[PDB]
């Protein structure tokens, strides 16, 4: 079928199962965010080393500076990866 | 590997190949937008009937009202589907 239908389900599905690991299922905590980047998304970003890097990066995706990242803020991070990544992904 | 890596590649990959159908590879035209919804995304939206519906909907994702939808605007539509869709996708 349409690839977007599978990606839309996978994007939402991963958030529900991944965020459901802790008793917090309706919001994402600061510690969980570090784990998400450490999982295997280091390909887009490889500057993780000191805790200050996560804090500096966390402020960038924070739009209302609420101190926490909800599902709406998580979508903003996805936009950051597409805009930051180059379109030279065409040929290897 | 991480599901997000496959989805990030599929989201960008589909845009390059799908938008490359017409000589316009750097921007999306109004007619192409109707085809995208008509493809098989009618699941999220099933109110397509008169051309006015597309125009009313097109204005909603338009942020700068430039009269055309670029790659940045396309991302906004994805956010609209996630916010509009309910989270009751858990159990069938
Ligand atoms: Ca959580
Ligand atoms: Ca925030
Ligand atoms: Ca195009
Ligand atoms: Ca526009």
A11, A74, A89: best mutation site toward chain B, by most B Cβ within 10 Å? A11
Task: Decide: B16 and B8 in contact? Cβ < 8 Å.
Answer: no
- Classify domain A1-92 by CATH number: 1.10.238.10
Distance of alpha carbon B2 from alpha carbon B42, whole angstroms: 28
Residue from A65, A64, A60 nearest A77 by CA: A60
- Characterise A4 by phi-psi region: left (phi > 0), alpha (psi -120 to 50), beta (else): alpha
CB burial of residue A77 (10 Å; 0-12, 13-18, 19+): middle
Where do we find the tokens 């450490």? A38
Experimental method: NMR
Q: Does A32 belong to an annotated binding site?
A: yes
Tell me if chain A has a CB within 8 Å of the CB of B45.
no
Tell me, yes or no, if A89 comes closer than 8 A to chain B by beta carbon. yes
Phi, psi of A69 (to 5 degrees): -115, 115
Task: Check B11 against A12: CB less than 8 A apart.
Answer: no
Between CA A69 and CA A63 the distance in angstroms is: 9
Q: How many Cβ atoms from other residues are within 10 Å of residue B58's Cβ?
A: 17
DSSP string, chain A: --HHHHHHHHHHHHHHHHHTTSS--SSB-HHHHHHHHHHHGGGT-----SHHHHHHHHHHH-SS--SSB-HHHHHHHHHHHHHHS-STTS--
The Cα A55–Cα A64 span in angstroms is 15
Distance from CA of A7 to the nearest CA of B (A): 6
The CA-CA-CA angle for residues A10, B16, B51, to 5°, reads: 85
Cα dist from B14 to A66, B18, B32, whole Å = 34, 5, 14
């Amino acid at each position: 079928m349409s690839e977007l239908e599978k990606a839309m389900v996978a994007l939402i599905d991963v958030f529900h199962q991944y965020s459901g690991r802790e008793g917090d299922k309706h919001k994402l905590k600061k510690s969980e965010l570090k784990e998400l980047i450490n999982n295997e998304l280091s390909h887009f970003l490889e500057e993780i080393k000191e805790q200050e890097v996560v804090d500096k990066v966390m402020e960038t995706l924070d739009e209302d500076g609420d101190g926490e990242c909800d599902f709406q803020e998580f979508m903003a991070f996805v936009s950051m990866v597409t805009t930051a990544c180059h379109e030279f992904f065409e040929h290897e």
